[PDB]
Design an enzyme around this catalytic site. Structure first.
Site, PDB file in Angstrom:
ATOM      1  N   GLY A  20       0.623  -1.089  -0.246  1.00  0.00           N
ATOM      2  CA  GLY A  20       0.071  -0.387  -0.101  1.00  0.00           C
ATOM      3  C   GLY A  20       0.933   1.139  -0.010  1.00  0.00           C
ATOM      4  O   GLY A  20       1.705   1.573   0.399  1.00  0.00           O
ATOM      5  N   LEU A  21       0.037   2.556  -0.512  1.00  0.00           N
ATOM      6  CA  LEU A  21       0.938   3.701  -0.600  1.00  0.00           C
ATOM      7  C   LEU A  21       2.105   3.573  -1.075  1.00  0.00           C
ATOM      8  O   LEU A  21       2.927   4.458  -1.494  1.00  0.00           O
ATOM      9  CB  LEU A  21       0.721   4.321   0.863  1.00  0.00           C
ATOM     10  N   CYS A  22       1.838   2.727  -2.468  1.00  0.00           N
ATOM     11  CA  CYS A  22       3.227   2.777  -3.430  1.00  0.00           C
ATOM     12  C   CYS A  22       2.965   4.196  -4.373  1.00  0.00           C
ATOM     13  O   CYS A  22       2.528   3.897  -5.466  1.00  0.00           O
ATOM     14  CB  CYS A  22       3.252   1.291  -3.352  1.00  0.00           C
ATOM     15  N   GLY A  23       3.715   4.863  -4.416  1.00  0.00           N
ATOM     16  CA  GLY A  23       2.582   6.395  -4.506  1.00  0.00           C
ATOM     17  C   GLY A  23       1.653   5.558  -4.273  1.00  0.00           C
ATOM     18  O   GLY A  23       0.246   5.690  -3.510  1.00  0.00           O
ATOM     19  N   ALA A  39       6.967   4.040  -8.042  1.00  0.00           N
ATOM     20  CA  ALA A  39       6.227   5.203  -6.764  1.00  0.00           C
ATOM     21  C   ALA A  39       6.300   5.752  -5.657  1.00  0.00           C
ATOM     22  O   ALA A  39       6.498   6.744  -5.002  1.00  0.00           O
ATOM     23  CB  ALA A  39       4.462   4.664  -7.397  1.00  0.00           C
TER      24      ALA A  39
END
Lengths: 245, 321
Positions: B86-89, B276
């Site tokens: 998660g939140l990989c950009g 990202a």
């Protein structure tokens, strides 16, 4: 200020007129009394402040009682020093004032003129029974929008909003729109900037809050709402922006 | 109190070190991924050479391949290669919002939106968008192997081998930049009669000279160039003979080429997630040292404040002793 209050008291008792009464700076008045007691040979109690500061500012606010003969709409100002609300000057003031507009430095770093942290200001007049339940309802909505936005700023700071949620982004751009629409020009303010301000009435503001928090304005742009007076004026400004292509 | 200020300052320092660590760490991940997507360049290369070869020799109006059988516009399926952590950009959320746009597109064409899925975050986004046909959700395939490629490839091949899914499409952010990747849906099924694959936007990507992510530093920020070197465009030999069939070998290479594009697409989505994530952690490290300076500024400000309280304690003594 005592002499100003005395002539104002002639207005409020002798003339018994409505006392529009503006004054600034009370924190500078406190600083003057501080250095005065420093001259006087009395031990300066606070950081620089006199011990006398308390009952003095109380006597200041106490003549400033809205009399029955003339109620005293006394707009005053605190040179809220060093951005210390917990400076005993502004602390001591925060009791005695009835409605302190807390003006941010930061929203003018955001460019809002006026830069009030409306989150930080507070009204005795703020009630549904007082303001209208519609007014205080939408007001609490916008207020907690701001509060959630400020809470969102923490995770927004390092990480950025890509880790945030989509309801989080919804609220974030929503209260961002609220903050931008809170920016409106002021009437005489042009001499720095150039804008002729709109004397933004309470109900057009209420409809704008309705559109913004209700997400009607969530297709209008945030930058378009910046220093935009009416939601109609925002709509026209957004029409200019949406025309600008 | 002052020590809590110093404490959260150190916390910010810890997270800042960690932030630079995360940026460089997923940079290393993406570096091995750049190695990875280049590590198959011979396979797809000689594949495309033989592809243009037997497409020249194909030359027919009667033969067919089953993947090449474009079927009736009844159900298009959507293939979603994704990211995992998660939140990989927000390559997850950007490609997933573009996937929601694809759900709208296949609801606009009425083509019965089946959704192939890859990636555990993609699996969770499919699992949290419960109003769709999730076709075969593939797991978060950490440095995906040709095994999982073969499996979900076979899922593609079976379903699109039926008319059941006719003309499916594959969503993936091709790793254009370490900063930009909006999602791109390459036309996955039915297989390309020219061999030159298309977009689901419609853009026929070239059979011969096509883009592929590599990374190079133009100035001190290391960068990403989606470079394009064309493979050898010789056919097979005039002395070479088709020992089994022209037509069946076309039908066979379709599984091969579909597999090649699918493995490349999963590599594209994985590298996009790696990049990202890396960019988000880098920008976070910048914001981190910024907040560190602000915090230490207020910290030494409070150091002056504690000194001022000491001065006050000194001052009372001046009347005292």
């Amino acid at each position: 200020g005592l002499t100003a209050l005395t002539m104002a008291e002639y207005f409020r008792d002798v003339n018994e007129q409505d006392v529009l009464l503006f004054i600034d700076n009370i924190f500078r008045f406190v600083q003057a009394g501080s250095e005065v007691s420093a001259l006087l040979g009395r031990m300066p109690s606070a950081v620089g402040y006199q011990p006398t500061l308390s009952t003095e500012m109380g006597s200041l606010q106490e003549r400033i009682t809205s009399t029955k003969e003339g109620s005293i709409t006394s707009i005053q100002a605190v040179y809220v020093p060093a951005d210390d609300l917990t400076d005993p000057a502004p602390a001591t003031t925060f009791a005695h004032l009835d409605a302190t507009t807390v003006l941010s430095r930061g929203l003018a770093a955001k460019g809002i003129y006026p830069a009030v942290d409306p989150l930080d200001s507070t009204s005795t007049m703020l009630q549904p029974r007082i303001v209208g339940e519609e007014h205080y309802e939408i007001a609490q909505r916008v207020k907690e929008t701001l509060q959630r936005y400020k809470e969102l700023q923490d995770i927004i700071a390092i990480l950025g909003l890509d880790e945030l949620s989509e309801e989080d982004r919804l609220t974030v751009a929503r209260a961002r729109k609220i903050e931008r629409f809170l920016s409106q020009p002021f009437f005489v303010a042009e001499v720095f900037t150039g804008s002729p301000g709109k004397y933004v009435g309470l109900a057009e503001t209420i409809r704008g809050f309705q559109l913004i928090l209700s997400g009607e304005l969530d297709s209008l742009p945030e930058q378009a709402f910046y220093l935009v007076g009416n939601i109609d004026e925002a709509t026209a400004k957004a029409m200019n922006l949406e025309m600008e292509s | 109190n002052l020590r809590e200020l110093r404490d959260r300052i150190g916390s910010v320092k810890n997270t800042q070190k960690i932030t630079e660590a995360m940026k460089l760490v997923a940079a290393a991940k993406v570096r091995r991924a750049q190695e990875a997507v280049v590590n198959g360049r011979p396979f797809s290369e000689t594949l495309v050479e033989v592809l243009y070869n037997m497409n020249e020799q194909l030359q027919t109006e009667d033969v067919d391949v089953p993947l090449t059988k474009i079927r009736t516009v009844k159900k298009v399926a959507l293939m979603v290669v994704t990211g995992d952590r998660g939140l990989c950009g927000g390559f997850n959320n950007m490609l997933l919002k573009k996937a929601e746009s694809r759900i709208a597109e296949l609801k606009k064409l009425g083509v019965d939106y089946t959704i192939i899925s890859i990636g555990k975050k993609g699996n969770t986004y499919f699992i949290r968008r419960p109003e769709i046909p999730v076709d075969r959700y593939f797991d978060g395939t950490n440095l995906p192997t040709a095994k999982e490629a073969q499996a979900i490839a076979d899922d593609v091949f079976s379903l699109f081998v039926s008319e059941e899914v006719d003309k499916v499409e594959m969503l993936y952010t091709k790793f254009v930049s370490l900063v930009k990747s909006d999602p791109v849906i390459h036309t996955l099924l039915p297989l390309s009669p020219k061999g030159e694959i298309c977009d689901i936007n419609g853009k026929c990507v070239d059979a011969a000279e096509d883009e592929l992510f590599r990374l190079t530093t133009k100035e001190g920020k290391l960068t990403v160039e989606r470079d394009m070197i064309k493979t050898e465009t010789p056919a097979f030999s005039p002395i070479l003979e088709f020992e089994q069939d022209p037509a069946q070998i076309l039908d066979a290479l379709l599984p091969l080429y579909l597999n090649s594009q699918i493995l490349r697409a999963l590599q594209e989505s994985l590298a996009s997630e790696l990049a990202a994530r890396m960019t988000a952690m880098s920008n976070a490290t910048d914001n981190a040292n910024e907040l560190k300076k602000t915090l230490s500024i207020n910290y030494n400000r409070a150091r002056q404040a504690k000194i001022t309280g000491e001065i006050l304690e000194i001052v009372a003594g001046a009347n005292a002793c």
